[PDB]
Assembly symmetry: D2
Homo-oligomer: 85 residues x 4
């Protein structure tokens, strides 16, 4: 600590960004499937866009949590700097 703490926060950011990326990839491939199995439809397009917004809301929650943690770290360092002047 505290570099260990931040190292965990960074590991979390990366891993979350990967999961998200692969959720998007799953969509791209789901469409690539129903592009040569049966031309894509409006219904498909709408549920897809819907899955995009949804999965991003999830990602954003994750990023917000990470943001809170780093903000705490910043406030701690701050206090130290306020004492030292």
């Amino acid at each position: 600590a505290p570099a260990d703490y931040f190292r965990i926060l960074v590991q979390q950011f990366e891993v979350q960004l990967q999961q998200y990326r692969q959720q998007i990839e799953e969509l791209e491939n789901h469409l690539a499937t129903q592009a040569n199995n049966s031309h894509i439809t409006p219904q498909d397009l709408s549920m897809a866009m819907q899955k995009i917004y949804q999965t991003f809301v999830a990602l954003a929650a994750q990023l917000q949590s990470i943001h809170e943690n780093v903000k705490v770290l910043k406030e701690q360092y701050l206090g130290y700097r306020k004492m030292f002047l």
Copy 2:
């Protein structure tokens, strides 16, 4: 004529989702290198999160445009469907 338009709307959605995934892939690959040579800093994490939000706001604009186009196609679809029924 309709199927063609929507075919182009589908092509747009896919290629937009591709570009998006590429930008995110760049971010990740940038953190995987800027963490190997030296150590990622809270500044990097912050700017990365920021670029994610910006990148999604862009993608979202693209998606809304596509959504308007399909909505129009739906308006016409109902234009006929209402007369014949």
Copy 3:
């Protein structure tokens, strides 16, 4: 029927290429964490390289499998064209 057979061969190719990507991407994600928070013995670099080669040999077996099927399809196409001329 010929178009259908080939259609299946085509989505088999794409999907095999997808899974191949996932295997790689995964290998990279394992390095973007186990090497950015800690160090990594060269023999782990060797293990990764070895997983690359093995994963490719698998992919190549898949590709040759589908290649045989298109080759047969070509032989049939050829038989028809030859009788006709």
Copy 4:
């Protein structure tokens, strides 16, 4: 230090693996493109496979170059080991 050199070797591996993934992804999107346009053809499948083999041979060359460097590093450590006995 030998850690700096090997650190560069690791950065090379990762970056070459990302590049590789990008070439495969590009080719993988190219098929998604020429699927919604017309229909993927045996010509396409053939050239695509050829692209896979060709791109992997390049990747393997890169990996071989890396392997020789780590090999040298190992022989060096070895020379030290034989002295210490």
